Amino acid sequence: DQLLGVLLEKAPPLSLLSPINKFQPEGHLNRVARAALLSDLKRRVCADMFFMTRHAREPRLISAYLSDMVSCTQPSVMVSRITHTNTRGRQVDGVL
Amino acid sequence: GTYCNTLNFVRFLELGLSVACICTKFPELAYVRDGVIQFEVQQPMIARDGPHPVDQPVHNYMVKRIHKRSLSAAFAIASEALSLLSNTYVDGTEIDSSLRIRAIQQMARNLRTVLDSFERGTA
Amino acid sequence: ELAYVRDGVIQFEVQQPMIARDGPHPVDQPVHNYMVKRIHKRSLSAAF
Amino acid sequence: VNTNCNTLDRLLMEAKAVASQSSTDTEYQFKRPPGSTEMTQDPCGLFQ
Amino acid sequence: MPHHPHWVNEHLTILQFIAPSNPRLRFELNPAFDFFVAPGDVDLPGPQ
Amino acid sequence: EFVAMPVSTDLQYFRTACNPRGRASGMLYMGDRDADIEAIMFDHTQSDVAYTDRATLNPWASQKHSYGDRLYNGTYNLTGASPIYSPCFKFFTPAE
Amino acid sequence: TGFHPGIAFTVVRQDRFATEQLLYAERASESYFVGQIQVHHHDAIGGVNFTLTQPRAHVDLGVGYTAVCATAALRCPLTDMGNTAQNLFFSRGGVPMLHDNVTESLRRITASGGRLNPTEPLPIFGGLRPATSAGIARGQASVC
Amino acid sequence: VGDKLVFLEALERRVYQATRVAYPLIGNIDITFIMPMGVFQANSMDRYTRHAGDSTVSEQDPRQFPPQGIFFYNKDGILTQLTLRDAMGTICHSS
Amino acid sequence: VGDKLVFLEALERRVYQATRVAYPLIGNIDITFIMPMGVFQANSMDRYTRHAGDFSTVSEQDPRQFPPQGIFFYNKDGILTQLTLRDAMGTICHSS
């Protein structure tokens, strides 16, 4: 149970920080940024709510695109040892 | 399960990104100061007769110019340079194998990532 | 001897990767990150 | 407005654009200051 | 009369009342006990 | 909670992202001082540029220290001992 | 207070949208020249540095449109409508005549607001340098 | 894609990783648009009434007439109000 | 799942079952709501009507122009009830 408690420290606003990793500002503006960040955050939390998957009827026809979009992650910078590779050439990505 | 390998080590001569370009070398590379070019493409004509006036082949030559880019790359460090240039030997003593090995390791490790970053930026 | 060992040797050397591009760029200086591996321990207890 | 080359060169030079006269992207919305250049495209700006 | 009249105008509805008025709006804080300014050493009724 | 409201209501301000009094406040305040929660509305001598159409949503309580800092506060001990909702004074105490 | 004017004051609409491109190449649609990198000695304030300088020559076919990019794709709206009107105060009017006191009273009446005063007076022979903004942690919008 | 084959690759895990630099191949567009107003016919005779009556034909209804301010839409999709008390300084006194 | 290969299993059926202690990692999530009951119009085009005989469930003198007394909140299946005076008859006499 203690080993499973890493979520509370492994769950920052990653979903919210993902777009900023590629859409970092490069100009010089503060008033418009202040006026627009609230709207951006409210639209993000409106479109990222669980109601979409709660009311969804066809998973693969509704939430599959969103799951594929949010399933993109970057590999770690530390190279591990030789993992258990399949005889047919299949690699292991992770666990869930 | 756990090893000692940080970041990622990649190269450019074996990546294979350049698949539709021919590599060329020119050790005697200097200022070109632009220049002139000339091209010749054979364009077939047409043959017709009647009320319309006859047509004759014509040749048109157009000259153009070229643009030369600029490359800039520099860093900012003083402690490493001072340490490297503070010895200047004394009178012809030994090579100081320990210090030489440490310098060869550190400078090469820094230069590898420096050149990797420079190549990535230029690409 | 896990009660008091204070490690002793570790390969904690991580730099900040940056693009070495000149021209219209500001002035900056790279910094080193000194991470730690100290996690607080919290557990319950029971008896019978 | 006046042309100085053939149709191909005219369309090639009209397919591009130069920096606008706006104050980058700030909220001041002033004239272009000397010392800031950016690549922008303004298609069909002369068509009104 | 020391200066121009303060709030003798009666043609203010929302913005004509909230934009220019400030001394007359600072005295209105809560709808329980209003406040007003007056010179010191003034009796009711005062002297000549 | 049972809180009174002024007779002047701002339906547009209420509908626009239901902003909680004044301006878009919270944690995204990176300025020159920590006393910007009232300077931006007490500077006066000019009617701003951008909006010029909303001074205060509820002037009965949004003006200086009138109601939010005088009803229960939370630092006078005796006044803060009332059995009220615990996560309700966070919007009135700047803290550190 | 009296006759309602019929004139209006509209706002110009401009959009600045950016979308990802899709570069197209061919067998000989792109080429570059590789030579020898020159080494130049550089001097620093506390040590010795090195600078790299080498001209680059690019040659293209120049016969048509071979490198076809992508059109406007689908992306999140990065343009926000922000009004920044009332910029006439920076010009202080014009036509200098015997109207200084009247125009000063008019400007005082029109600028005697009660919300916020970042900048307003702008006296003669004044610079009015912009204030210091935040760092590099902000959003993106537009004005009109 | 039929009788032709293309050469595509996805090289993204080796570039633009942990770098605080501006994204390249970004092109800003510039489109000029106007917002004309003043919808009012010369003759007020081409009008009728709807079948439903569940009323907007009152003599004191300012909706059928242009307002004092300017009504323009924004990104949020709502209609804002802008009075002329600040824009009155647009008098053409340069004559 | 998607374009990757990751583990997909549930461990909740093998640990902490048929026991007094429930599943751990159960936090408290609360969402705030606003239900205003005061309506304040601005224009003079909200107190007039042509006819009030759409439905025959009311009398001819329908008092639809009067402001509403309150807002009926839903209750499970939906019950139109309003009980606020009996709970907050006096709460501002001493405060004022």
Side-chain angles (χ1 to χ4, degrees), chain A residues 1-30 32-59 61-80 82-96, chain B residues 1-30 32 34-48 50-68 70-99 101-123, chain C residues 1-21 23-48, chain D, chain E residues 1-23 25-48, chain F residues 2-96, chain G residues 1-107 109-144, chain H residues 1-12 15-19 21-84 86-95, chain I residues 1-19 21-96:
Chain A
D1 196 10
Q2 197 168 296
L3 276 190
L4 198 138
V6 79
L7 269 163
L8 56 103
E9 68 254 42
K10 267 338 222 88
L14 34 106
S15 66
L16 258 300
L17 214 80
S18 188
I20 218 66
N21 284 143
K22 81 173 299 298
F23 287 124
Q24 46 260 12
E26 286 288 330
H28 221 197
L29 45 98
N30 68 307
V32 278
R34 194 67 55 85
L37 69 92
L38 258 308
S39 78
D40 287 331
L41 257 64
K42 74 181 291 294
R43 93 184 63 247
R44 208 79 190 98
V45 304
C46 176
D48 281 353
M49 230 174 76
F50 325 116
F51 174 75
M52 198 272 315
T53 199
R54 270 212 323 277
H55 92 102
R57 281 172 171 85
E58 218 70 41
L61 278 183
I62 292 176
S63 291
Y65 315 102
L66 275 86
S67 83
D68 199 67
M69 186 255 289
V70 305
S71 77
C72 189
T73 191
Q74 43 201 13
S76 197
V77 297
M78 218 278 300
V79 175
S80 65
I82 303 172
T83 198
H84 34 271
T85 65
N86 203 260
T87 69
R88 268 88 59 93
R90 188 205 47 85
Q91 81 279 329
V92 199
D93 288 327
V95 300
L96 198 145
Chain B
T2 310
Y3 275 157
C4 198
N5 203 243
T6 61
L7 54 92
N8 157 72
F9 298 97
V10 86
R11 265 92 69 189
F12 198 76
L13 82 155
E14 46 99 17
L15 187 75
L17 200 50
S18 43
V19 83
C21 186
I22 306 300
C23 184
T24 175
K25 285 301 289 292
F26 211 57
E28 39 168 15
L29 187 126
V32 183
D34 306 327
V36 286
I37 211 73
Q38 187 65 40
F39 293 110
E40 173 65 41
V41 176
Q42 289 172 108
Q43 171 246 341
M45 228 73 195
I46 48 162
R48 46 173 161 163
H52 39 86
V54 74
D55 299 332
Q56 298 260 3
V58 80
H59 278 283
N60 203 359
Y61 314 106
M62 184 83 253
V63 84
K64 275 203 72 50
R65 280 181 171 89
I66 212 165
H67 171 261
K68 299 290 301 297
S70 190
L71 174 66
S72 42
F75 36 80
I77 186 67
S79 56
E80 258 85 5
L82 277 174
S83 178
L84 196 136
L85 273 185
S86 198
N87 37 25
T88 77
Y89 279 177
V90 278
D91 79 305
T93 43
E94 263 293 323
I95 211 158
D96 214 347
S97 67
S98 50
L99 271 186
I101 279 301
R102 186 73 64 86
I104 281 298
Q105 260 292 301
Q106 191 77 24
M107 297 302 115
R109 194 193 72 88
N110 290 328
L111 203 54
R112 276 164 172 170
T113 168
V114 156
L115 80 96
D116 197 87
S117 186
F118 176 68
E119 218 277 334
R120 194 232 310 274
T122 49
Chain C
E1 214 74 29
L2 198 141
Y4 274 105
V5 85
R6 61 189 36 89
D7 208 358
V9 45
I10 199 72
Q11 45 264 14
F12 273 177
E13 207 273 326
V14 172
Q15 57 258 16
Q16 175 181 0
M18 279 299 291
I19 302 292
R21 189 74 257 161
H25 71 296
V27 276
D28 276 281
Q29 182 190 3
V31 75
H32 199 278
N33 198 7
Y34 323 105
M35 73 267 295
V36 282
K37 293 296 163 275
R38 264 81 177 172
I39 311 294
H40 65 280
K41 166 80 185 310
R42 178 73 173 88
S43 191
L44 313 173
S45 66
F48 206 96
Chain D
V1 52
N2 194 25
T3 178
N4 41 45
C5 281
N6 37 63
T7 58
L8 263 83
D9 283 335
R10 175 163 87 223
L11 73 96
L12 193 69
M13 73 182 182
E14 92 177 2
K16 331 283 158 65
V18 284
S20 72
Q21 37 91 34
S22 188
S23 270
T24 45
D25 59 356
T26 197
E27 80 258 19
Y28 270 160
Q29 202 31 256
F30 291 155
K31 231 60 169 60
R32 192 69 173 174
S36 45
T37 45
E38 210 263 339
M39 291 291 114
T40 189
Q41 172 87 2
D42 185 75
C44 67
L46 81 155
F47 275 101
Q48 217 163 180
Chain E
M1 287 273 113
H3 281 94
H4 59 92
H6 205 74
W7 59 295
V8 302
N9 310 117
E10 293 300 315
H11 299 285
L12 321 178
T13 42
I14 163 71
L15 71 106
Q16 285 86 230
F17 165 69
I18 207 152
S21 175
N22 285 316
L25 203 56
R26 279 179 315 211
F27 282 129
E28 179 53 72
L29 191 65
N30 35 51
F33 217 82
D34 251 342
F35 309 109
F36 81 112
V37 82
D41 211 71
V42 162
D43 290 331
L44 295 182
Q48 293 301 102
Chain F
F2 202 80
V3 54
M5 274 288 121
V7 80
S8 281
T9 81
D10 221 354
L11 193 61
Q12 187 56 54
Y13 182 80
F14 222 69
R15 285 177 183 267
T16 302
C18 60
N19 294 318
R21 188 254 313 281
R23 230 187 168 124
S25 54
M27 212 255 290
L28 296 113
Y29 272 164
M30 304 300 169
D32 37 49
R33 53 200 160 100
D34 80 307
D36 282 341
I37 210 63
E38 84 257 29
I40 60 171
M41 47 95 53
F42 222 76
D43 205 1
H44 304 324
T45 80
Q46 212 271 118
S47 197
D48 261 325
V49 165
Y51 270 125
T52 323
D53 278 299
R54 40 173 199 88
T56 42
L57 155 81
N58 36 36
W60 284 6
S62 72
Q63 215 172 348
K64 57 174 77 53
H65 31 87
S66 51
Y67 275 165
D69 218 15
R70 312 294 132 181
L71 270 175
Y72 46 87
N73 205 302
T75 197
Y76 302 139
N77 293 319
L78 190 125
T79 79
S82 284
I84 56 163
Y85 208 51
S86 28
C88 272
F89 82 111
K90 251 91 83 170
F91 311 107
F92 301 96
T93 48
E96 212 274 337
Chain G
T1 189
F3 163 67
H4 149 261
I7 212 72
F9 205 63
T10 47
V11 45
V12 183
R13 186 70 254 131
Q14 44 250 31
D15 284 324
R16 183 217 58 88
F17 202 40
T19 39
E20 198 86 18
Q21 324 189 318
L22 182 120
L23 193 59
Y24 181 69
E26 265 202 342
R27 313 138 288 115
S29 192
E30 36 97 18
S31 188
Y32 51 89
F33 212 89
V34 178
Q36 207 265 331
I37 176 67
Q38 290 96 2
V39 184
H40 191 258
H41 175 75
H42 196 73
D43 263 0
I45 211 155
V48 47
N49 289 343
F50 270 93
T51 164
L52 265 73
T53 304
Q54 182 190 194
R56 206 85 269 159
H58 31 83
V59 53
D60 198 75
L61 44 94
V63 81
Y65 275 161
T66 326
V68 181
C69 295
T71 53
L74 195 129
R75 220 214 269 273
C76 318
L78 303 172
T79 39
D80 216 318
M81 279 79 165
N83 48 6
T84 41
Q86 288 315 304
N87 214 12
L88 198 136
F89 312 120
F90 268 31
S91 80
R92 221 184 54 214
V95 195
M97 273 163 181
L98 264 303
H99 208 255
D100 301 332
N101 53 283
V102 202
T103 198
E104 275 153 27
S105 87
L106 254 296
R107 97 196 288 175
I109 288 169
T110 204
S112 55
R115 272 217 65 191
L116 178 76
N117 184 26
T119 44
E120 186 50 54
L122 195 35
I124 193 60
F125 303 119
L128 201 127
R129 292 131 288 274
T132 306
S133 79
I136 41 171
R138 266 105 50 107
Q140 194 193 54
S142 55
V143 283
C144 46
Chain H
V1 281
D3 74 288
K4 209 183 188 83
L5 189 138
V6 309
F7 203 69
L8 75 146
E9 267 95 34
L11 191 63
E12 212 89 348
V15 278
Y16 318 110
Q17 295 292 317
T19 50
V21 285
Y23 202 66
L25 51 95
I26 288 296
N28 304 334
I29 212 72
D30 276 324
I31 314 293
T32 48
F33 278 144
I34 60 166
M35 293 272 175
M37 73 109 65
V39 181
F40 173 70
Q41 280 89 7
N43 200 6
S44 304
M45 217 68 74
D46 288 328
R47 276 200 301 269
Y48 44 86
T49 185
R50 217 60 250 172
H51 278 337
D54 206 12
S55 59
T56 36
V57 290
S58 67
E59 58 259 10
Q60 276 107 19
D61 169 61
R63 255 60 196 157
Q64 306 179 354
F65 322 120
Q68 187 147 350
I70 165 70
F71 275 152
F72 70 103
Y73 274 86
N74 75 316
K75 188 183 186 305
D76 293 330
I78 211 63
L79 204 57
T80 61
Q81 177 70 78
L82 274 187
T83 196
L84 261 73
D86 294 320
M88 91 294 198
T90 54
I91 319 289
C92 42
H93 63 276
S94 53
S95 298
Chain I
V1 54
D3 78 308
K4 312 155 303 305
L5 297 109
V6 290
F7 275 4
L8 203 137
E9 50 100 21
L11 286 161
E12 297 102 11
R13 323 256 69 85
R14 261 89 75 192
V15 280
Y16 299 116
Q17 78 263 18
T19 42
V21 55
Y23 201 68
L25 275 186
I26 306 293
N28 193 273
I29 283 94
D30 70 301
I31 304 295
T32 182
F33 309 107
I34 33 170
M35 281 96 60
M37 70 106 83
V39 180
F40 163 67
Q41 29 81 28
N43 214 267
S44 67
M45 282 284 106
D46 219 4
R47 275 92 61 230
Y48 77 111
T49 174
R50 183 185 290 173
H51 77 303
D54 212 322
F55 26 80
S56 292
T57 42
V58 282
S59 205
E60 54 92 20
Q61 198 253 316
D62 212 20
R64 213 255 170 272
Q65 77 262 7
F66 291 163
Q69 204 153 331
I71 298 299
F72 296 96
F73 36 81
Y74 284 160
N75 287 113
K76 293 104 205 160
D77 295 332
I79 307 292
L80 299 169
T81 36
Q82 171 190 349
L83 281 99
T84 49
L85 292 178
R86 213 240 200 270
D87 292 334
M89 31 180 182
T91 196
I92 210 72
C93 295
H94 88 286
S95 310
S96 64

